[PDB]
Amino acid sequence: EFDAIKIALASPDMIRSWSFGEVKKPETINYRTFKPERDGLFCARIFGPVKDYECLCGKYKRLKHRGVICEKCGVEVTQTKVRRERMGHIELASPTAHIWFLKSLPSRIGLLLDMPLRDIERVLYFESYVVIEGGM
Amino acid sequence: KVTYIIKASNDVLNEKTATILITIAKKDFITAAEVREVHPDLGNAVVNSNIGVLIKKGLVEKSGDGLIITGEAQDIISNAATLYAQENAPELLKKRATRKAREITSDMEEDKDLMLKLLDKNGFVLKKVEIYRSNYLAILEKRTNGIRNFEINNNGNMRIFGYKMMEHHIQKFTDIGMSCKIAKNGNVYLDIKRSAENIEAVITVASEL
Amino acid sequence: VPLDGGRFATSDLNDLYRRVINRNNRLKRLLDLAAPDIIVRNEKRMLQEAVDALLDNGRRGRAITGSNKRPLKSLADMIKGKQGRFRQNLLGKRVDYSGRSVITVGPYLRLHQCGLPKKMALELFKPFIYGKLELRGLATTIKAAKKMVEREEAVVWDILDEVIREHPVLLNRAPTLHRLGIQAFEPVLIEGKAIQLHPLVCAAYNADFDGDQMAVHVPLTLEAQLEARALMMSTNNILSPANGEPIIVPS
Amino acid sequence: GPEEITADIPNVGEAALSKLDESGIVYIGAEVTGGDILVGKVTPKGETQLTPEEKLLRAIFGEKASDVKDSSLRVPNGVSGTVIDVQVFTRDGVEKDKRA
Amino acid sequence: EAKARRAKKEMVEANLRLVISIAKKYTNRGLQFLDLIQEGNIGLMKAVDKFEYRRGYKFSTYATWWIRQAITRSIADQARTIRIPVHMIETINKLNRISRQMLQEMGREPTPEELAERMLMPEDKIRKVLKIAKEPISMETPIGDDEDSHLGDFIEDTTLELPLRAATHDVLAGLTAREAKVLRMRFGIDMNTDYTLEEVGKQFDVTRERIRQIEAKALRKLRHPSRSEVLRSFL
Amino acid sequence: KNIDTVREIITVASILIKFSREDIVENRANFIAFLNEIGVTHEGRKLNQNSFRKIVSELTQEDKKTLIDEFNEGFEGVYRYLEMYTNK
Amino acid sequence: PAGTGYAYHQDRMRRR
Amino acid sequence: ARVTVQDAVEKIGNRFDLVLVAARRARQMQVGGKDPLVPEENDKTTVIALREIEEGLINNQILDVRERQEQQEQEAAEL
Amino acid sequence: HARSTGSYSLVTQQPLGGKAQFGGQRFGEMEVWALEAYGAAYTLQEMLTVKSDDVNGRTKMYKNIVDGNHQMEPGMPESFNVLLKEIRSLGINIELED
Ligand SMILES: [Mg+2]
Ligand SMILES: [Zn+2]
């Protein structure tokens, strides 16, 4: 069916194209009932229906209304396998160095910038500042 | 015949597609070759023109090769046989005797008299007193002691019915020997025979709850 | 997953994501209140610490732990080592249609056949005897045939005397050193609960009869039956692959 | 709702139920085999996504479904022996059966 | 504005040590250090936002309330694996106080009835509060005697019940030949030869709209209270 | 006897709920209207609700076993999947 | 691509 | 019946294509409704196919000839 | 201990381990080396794909094998799809080509 594996880095627009929404809140479950929440780490309108063709609120369990989102909460009633491949994302408000490109030994950022790893560590941990294009 | 068809369709048809419509509604999902077979007087594209009218009106449609009317044309046919019954088979459209059914006894009247006498006596006010299924309803004002109504059936049994009655009230009415039927939501039946001594006993146990 | 009782069962990775987006939201709020630079500086420090703790908990000088004084498992150590996906889940799997027991001798056997206990053979060949009971019409629906094999009629033993007639099985001993540790045999049903085994094989498996346990497996498809009978069968392999010396030397 | 230790249990034969008392616990001394039942436990369960057998049996035959399924403690498979005693522990504030 | 803000910066930098000194009370409560420190920094921000110097009071007294506000609010909303609300956390803490003094004063142990006299709550809620006072289990926890096996090795799936060419081919396999018998003796639809599978699927579409069609005829007879003898007069 | 009429009832039910058209079985009067228009017949006439509950009622246990066993034959691909994950 | 799969990869590799 | 498969290697000298030829043939005899050539002794299709290999009247070539001929009867008998 | 088809795990669709839990037998990767030491192509294929991981493969196998057929429909192991999503979950884009 398919030939070779292609492997690359991840563009930010690529991993926005992977996602089906943005998780926002660190809460998980309903406690009283055990339903997932609005946009927490477990969600219906991000990741899919938790139950067997059963909505979050519970109107469009109908087989005639199967496949359409609801109106109280908007849950597309589909299969339950679908919650094993819908990735999500989170918008970091600050840039962040990936650890594998900083401490792989050899550092890729390190020898790419021609710069010792002690110094780049000093730039990362806010204790020594760096210059961008001093020019004249 | 087709007078009732074209008349029942409000003259949107002619006699060709009338008797063709009788053929289509006559056997379900028949072929149009059988329609042209039982209509040798009409041409092939004449029958196909009339089916072009019924398809054009959307009444008769296909199921693959299928040919059948819809429910509105079915209502035209049933109105046609209705007027055909009004004008051709008059006594076939008839009706036989109808049951009432049940009629209130005068013992139920007198037991209603002592019932309202002892509920009006003991300060238990009433929402409404109703003859319903020809049965009396001494309905309580509020759901007091989990009880709804103090009813009388005409089957010799005065009954006390409620919603989430306590167990000790039920024990107090099984002191005077009354049946009970709990429900899955708290609805409780209490059967006793309709008699004046049971009026005094039920209303004196209800008067001490 | 809620397990048996009120107890819940989570991965630590849920907690790890919860730390990082928690810290992200607090950084957003601290930028919204216009804090001094020490606060937002250390906030960005801790966010960097949480992200890089999530991608590899342990490449930092101190791996953070969640509970029970034991470091939690990030995305890096879901893959490496013996406990990762590779050496545990994709390269060696747990497989249906199989079993194990204790072995014994029984010298009345030809070497292309091995003894097999009848309760195992009734267990591991349930779809076959379901298919034959549907084929002969002694049952009609599937659950009737299930009731006939738990009810234990006398007619089923003929049926697993035809489905074990030329259907080979595979035998295994767990420290598989060289390739004579997976061998195929025709079975013969016997009583008891142990697997009999031909005495000229105890040198090939490096098997002594002090209580070793062997695993059995079933080839399902037809090509696997031909690969078993043509290549895995015990008569075809009498010489070592290390040298031309035979392995069937009497001990 | 909670679970029950009742003797009634759907879709089983009376040969299995002959070994119990009227409460749902086997008598002290019953010879048992693999697959028998010891303590009849039921678990209430709606929204079952019912199968075509009880689609037919519910629909055509006048018959309600079961809001509850089996969770009885059965014998582990293969073994056989003799029940020699049975202990009962009840949470306080819970009404007891006859057997405790 | 900027003048007042840098003044506030100076006050915050003066009181960071107070935040660390009060921060030690909540270390092993399910958070880290920097969580508590940064929440305390927020508490200093709202503390300096509402301070009065004219009260003649040293700043520490007015600060400590806002610091305990931010910290206690923070562990209230962030500590557990599931965010339970704040007031039953307060209720739990009451039951740990009352559990402590009623424990060692009663000597033996607390029963929930003794909690039903020390607290006035009707003891049905007490066992619920005792029910939700728990935290989950990591799957990578080892089994006893440190055998290399985890909890995730043992927990099993449950939802394993009741799930185009083979989809149509199974429907032809689904017929036990009584079905097609009454599909051609009553519905006229014919499974005769090994057709094109498109003729099979379109044929089944004719079946579906066929029974929908007879359904649409079927519901409409529930109008006229008459007998079929006048209905068969035109047949 | 009437047992054959019940055979066509459950067979029409098998086709009916097999072809994703469910709602017309659980309601009863419309279902009997469907059966009357497709032309099933016990003793020369149409089907009444009293007559329906009689013919379901006047029935032998072994024949009922035969009817559900015949009914399970079309639904075999569901039951194999149903019991393949329950062989404990 | 060793046992039977070597003939299989001769086939599939030959088709490409 | 079947104890060794040596004769199959003697008449087809590769031993890795034997699972292909006997797999194709035995698949033609179990699911496909066609009869064997060696008479039956109530055995599975494995031993039947390998014994047809032992008779030397079945290999890859003759199966290609008869499948060729079968689809020739499909397009030739289609009309 | 013996097992035709029992319960399956949750995170990876694989059988369980042990006797108390009605588990299957571990087919370790040294035994895989033993199989490709032979020319056993198909047996190694069905003993890690059909019999373990592909849910559609094992359902179609079970239905065909009670229908008298002996034929496999391999597809893809689900655990590889898990590893695909998991190392996809870092900043490492990997894909499947034509
Ligand atoms: Mg040993
Ligand atoms: Zn919804």
Author numbering:
A (entry chain D): 16 to 151
B (entry chain M): 3 to 211
C (entry chain D): 253 to 503
D (entry chain C): 846 to 945
E (entry chain F): 369 to 531, 540 to 611
F (entry chain I): 3 to 90
G (entry chain D): 1358 to 1373
H (entry chain E): 2 to 80
Lines from the paper:
Transcription of T4 middle genes proceeds by activation of T4 middle promoters through a process called σ appropriation, which requires the concerted effort of two T4-encoded transcription factors: AsiA and MotA. In this process, the co-activator AisA binds to and remodels σR4, which then allows the activator MotA to interact with σR4, as well. In addition, the conformational change of σR4 prevents its normal contact with the promoter -35 element, so the transcription of host genes is inhibited. Here, we report a single-particle cryo-electron microscopy (cryo-EM) structure of an intact σ appropriation complex, comprising AsiA, MotA, Escherichia coli RNA polymerase (RNAP), σ70 and a T4 middle promoter.
To obtain a structure of σ appropriation complex, we used a nucleic-acid scaffold corresponding to positions −45 to +15 of a T4 middle promoter (PuvsX, positions numbered relative to the transcription start site). We then froze the complex, collected data on Titan Krios and determined the structure at a nominal resolution of 3.79 Å. The RNAP, σR2 and σR3 of the structure are very similar to the previously reported E. coli RNAP–promoter open complex (RPo) structure with root-mean-square deviation (RMSD) of 1.284 Å (3551 Cαs aligned). Compared with the structure of RPo, the conformation of the C-terminal helix of σR3.2 and σR4 in σ appropriation complex is dramatically different. The C-terminal helix of σR3.2 (530-543) and the first helix of σR4 (S1) form a continuous helix in RPo. However, most residues of the C-terminal helix of σR3.2 (532-539) become disordered in σ appropriation complex probably due to clash with the C-terminal helix of AsiA (A6; see below). σR4 adopts an elongated conformation with all helices completely reorganized. Strikingly, whereas in the NMR structure of AsiA in complex with σR4, A6 binds to a pocket on the remainder of AsiA, in σ appropriation complex, A6 is rotated by ∼90°, about a ‘pivot’ formed by the short loop between A5 and A6, inserted into the RNA exit channel in the same orientation as the C-terminal helix of σR3.2 in RPo, and contacted by βCTR. In σ appropriation complex, FTH binds the hydrophobic pocket of AsiA, which is occupied by A6 in the NMR structure. In our structure, the HTH motif contacts the upstream portion of the MotA box with A4 inserting into the major groove of DNA between positions -32 and -37. In particular, two conserved positively charged residues (R55 and K56) on A4 and one conserved positively charged residue (R47) on the loop form three salt bridges with the DNA backbone phosphates. In the structure of σ appropriation complex, the trans-activation domain, MotANTD, interacts with the remodeled σR4, while, the DNA binding domain, MotACTD binds the MotA box.
